[PDB]
Amino acid sequence: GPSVFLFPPKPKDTLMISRTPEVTCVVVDVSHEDPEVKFNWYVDGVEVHNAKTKPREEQYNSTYRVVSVLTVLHQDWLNGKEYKCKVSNKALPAPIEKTISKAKGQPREPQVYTLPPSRDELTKNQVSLTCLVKGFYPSDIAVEWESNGQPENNYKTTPPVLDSDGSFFLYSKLTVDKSRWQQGNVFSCSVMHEALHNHYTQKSLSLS
Amino acid sequence: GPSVFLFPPKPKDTLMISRTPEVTCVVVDVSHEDPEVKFNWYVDGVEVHNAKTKPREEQYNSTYRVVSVLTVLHQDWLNGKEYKCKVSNKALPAPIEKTISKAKGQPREPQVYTLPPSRDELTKNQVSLTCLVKGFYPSDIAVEWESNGQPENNYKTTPPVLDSDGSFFLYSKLTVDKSRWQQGNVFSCSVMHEALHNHYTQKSLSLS
Numbered sequence: 001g002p003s004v005f006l007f008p009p010k011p012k013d014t015l016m017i018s019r020t021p022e023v024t025c026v027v028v029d030v031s032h033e034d035p036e037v038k039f040n041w042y043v044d045g046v047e048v049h050n051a052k053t054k055p056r057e058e059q060y061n062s063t064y065r066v067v068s069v070l071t072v073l074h075q076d077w078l079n080g081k082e083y084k085c086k087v088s089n090k091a092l093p094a095p096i097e098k099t100i101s102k103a104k105g106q107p108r109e110p111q112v113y114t115l116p117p118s119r120d121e122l123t124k125n126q127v128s129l130t131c132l133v134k135g136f137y138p139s140d141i142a143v144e145w146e147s148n149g150q151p152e153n154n155y156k157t158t159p160p161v162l163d164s165d166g167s168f169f170l171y172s173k174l175t176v177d178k179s180r181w182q183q184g185n186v187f188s189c190s191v192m193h194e195a196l197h198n199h200y201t202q203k204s205l206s207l208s
Numbered sequence: 209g210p211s212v213f214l215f216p217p218k219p220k221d222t223l224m225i226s227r228t229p230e231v232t233c234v235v236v237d238v239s240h241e242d243p244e245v246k247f248n249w250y251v252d253g254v255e256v257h258n259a260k261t262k263p264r265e266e267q268y269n270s271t272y273r274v275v276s277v278l279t280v281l282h283q284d285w286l287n288g289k290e291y292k293c294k295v296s297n298k299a300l301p302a303p304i305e306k307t308i309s310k311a312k313g314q315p316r317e318p319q320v321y322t323l324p325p326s327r328d329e330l331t332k333n334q335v336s337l338t339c340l341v342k343g344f345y346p347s348d349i350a351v352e353w354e355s356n357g358q359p360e361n362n363y364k365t366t367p368p369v370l371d372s373d374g375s376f377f378l379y380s381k382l383t384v385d386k387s388r389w390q391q392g393n394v395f396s397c398s399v400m401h402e403a404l405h406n407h408y409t410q411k412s413l414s415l416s
């Protein structure tokens with residue numbers, strides 16, 4: 001029989017007003033005989049009608065994968081609205097319902113610390129500037145770097161990691177030419193997270 | 209239907225000739241109507257017979273979990289040999305095969321930098337010591353901490369993260385009592401990786 005999986009929006013889509021956070025209802029093991037899937041969607045129990053139907057895909061094992069995509073309001077997802085996908089198909093005895101929402105739990109604001117390059121690293125041509133972001137909940141977060149008003153893009157950020165108190169941490173690493181560090185340029189780590197004031201905070205790092 | 213997960217040996221087990229490196233094949237969602245699980249193991253397509261299959265354990269959601277453990281040679285694993293688990297159960301349309309092996313590519317030696325806490329973090333009663341381990345390949349690595357001859361426990365380590373030159377980096381975060389750090393105790397980050405000399409290096413950190 002068919003089975004249903006329900007996926008949340010991307011963390012980063014929820015935190016950016018220009019992005020479209022979507023909840024995705026996915027039905028697998030849909031037979032060729034009875035391939036037609038009906039989707040009903042509910043927001044805090046009340047039905048909504050604006051979901052997008054996607055064309056099915058046959059799946060090598062000769063079953064269809066069938067998907068419905070519901071756009072969620074940024075503030076609805078953040079305020080813990082519950083989203084329910086109800087799937088009806090001829091090969092089911094009764095419809096299947098799956099439900100999802102943002103991670104529950106008291107949100108906690110990230111603490112942001114910057115760490116200069118280690119001394120031993122100045123033997124090398126490039127240096128690591130480190131941004132430690134810790135104590136945040138839930139784990140949805142976005143971290144960037146900038147300098148003299150313009151984005152720095154040669155950085156990598158670890159996934160959030162669960163700490164012992166139940167909150168999360170991560171590190172972001174900005175690589176810059178050691179000449180820029182020794183020359184005293186000013187670099188900043190910026191963080192977006194629902195629990196920050198204006199969902200935004202930034203911390204600078206420079207030689208001294 | 210049931211699902212199969214295949215796990216590699218522990219980085220520490222492969223880096224020491226003195227330890228037992230094992231590949232583990234885990235089958236979950238084994239029902240009551242079809243409780244039989246048959247395992248076939250292969251090394252480069254040749255069947256092998258030394259696997260130890262465990263008694264099945266019933267799960268809370270009314271499924272069975274069945275584990276098969278295959279002990280392997282260090283020199284077979286570092287020679288990039290492929291290890292294949294084939295799982296058979298009456299409720300599978302076809303048998304499931306998983307394969308794992310050591311990642312291909314030339315080994316690259318990690319560099320290890322220790323980082324003291326940010327000056328802004330010397331306000332809290334706990335402080336974070338950071339170990340940055342970068343430049344290594346493959347991603348298999350073990351990181352621990354010690355002080356005054358005994359192991360530290362209160363640390364968390366990020367998964368390895370792909371850098372833009374194809375090598376990996378991670379951070380490890382050791383949390384310590386601020387007074388223990390102010391009173392001059394030496395802390396060290398210990399790293400094991402196959403491209404380090406005798407598979408081990410150590411970097412120590414103290415209040416400066």
Ligand SMILES: *[C@@H]1O[C@H](CO)[C@@H](O[C@@H]2O[C@H](CO)[C@@H](O[C@@H]3O[C@H](CO[C@H]4O[C@H](CO)[C@@H](O)[C@H](O)[C@@H]4O[C@@H]4O[C@H](CO)[C@@H](O[C@@H]5O[C@H](CO)[C@H](O)[C@H](O)[C@H]5O)[C@H](O)[C@H]4NC(C)=O)[C@@H](O)[C@H](O[C@H]4O[C@H](CO)[C@@H](O)[C@H](O)[C@@H]4O)[C@@H]3O)[C@H](O)[C@H]2NC(C)=O)[C@H](O)[C@H]1NC(C)=O
Pocket residue numbers: 005006007008009010021022023024026028029059061063065209301
């Ligand atoms: C016939 O062959 C098909 C071949 O696939 C089989 O189909 C599979 O059936 C499996 C169950 O039997 C099912 O397993 C579940 O997988 C999920 C996780 O699935 C994600 O990751 C998979 C592997 O990495 C992907 O292949 C999946 O496609 C899926 O990827 C995610 O898909 C999301 C929705 O499209 C997408 O989110 C959206 O992305 C867009 C932008 O792209 C927007 O941002 C939007 O906002 C998002 O919503 C994700 O980005 C995408 N992620 C990735 C990495 O690709 C797994 O969670 C689940 O098991 C878990 O169940 C719960 C939660 O669901 C969890 O709590 C449990 O702990 C448990 O681990 C299942 O294992 C497969 O997904 C599915 N494969 C596909 C492609 O559908 C059939 O089963 C075969 N039939 C038979 C009889 O064999």
Ligand SMILES: *[C@@H]1O[C@H](CO)[C@@H](O[C@@H]2O[C@H](CO)[C@@H](O[C@@H]3O[C@H](CO[C@H]4O[C@H](CO)[C@@H](O)[C@H](O)[C@@H]4O[C@@H]4O[C@H](CO)[C@@H](O[C@@H]5O[C@H](CO)[C@H](O)[C@H](O)[C@H]5O)[C@H](O)[C@H]4NC(C)=O)[C@@H](O)[C@H](O[C@H]4O[C@H](CO)[C@@H](O)[C@H](O)[C@@H]4O)[C@@H]3O)[C@H](O)[C@H]2NC(C)=O)[C@H](O)[C@H]1NC(C)=O
Pocket residue numbers: 211213215216217218229230231232234236237267268269271273
């Ligand atoms: C009914 O109830 C059961 C039981 O809960 C459910 O079973 C679960 O189904 C999940 C999938 O649907 C599956 O989720 C996958 O988990 C893996 C990671 O698994 C490890 O980490 C988990 C926690 O993070 C643990 O729960 C697991 O037990 C597992 O722990 C590891 O186990 C290894 C085997 O022992 C061990 O390695 C060995 O350790 C020994 C120790 O002595 C030796 O060192 C040996 O040499 C080693 O080989 C590890 O140490 C141990 N690790 C830890 C941290 O404990 C996860 O990767 C996976 O996610 C992805 O899987 C593939 C990635 O390759 C990916 O492609 C997919 O897209 C997917 O996203 C899944 O999350 C659960 O693990 C599983 N739970 C258990 C206990 O088996 C059923 O699903 C339920 N059924 C229904 C219908 O509800």
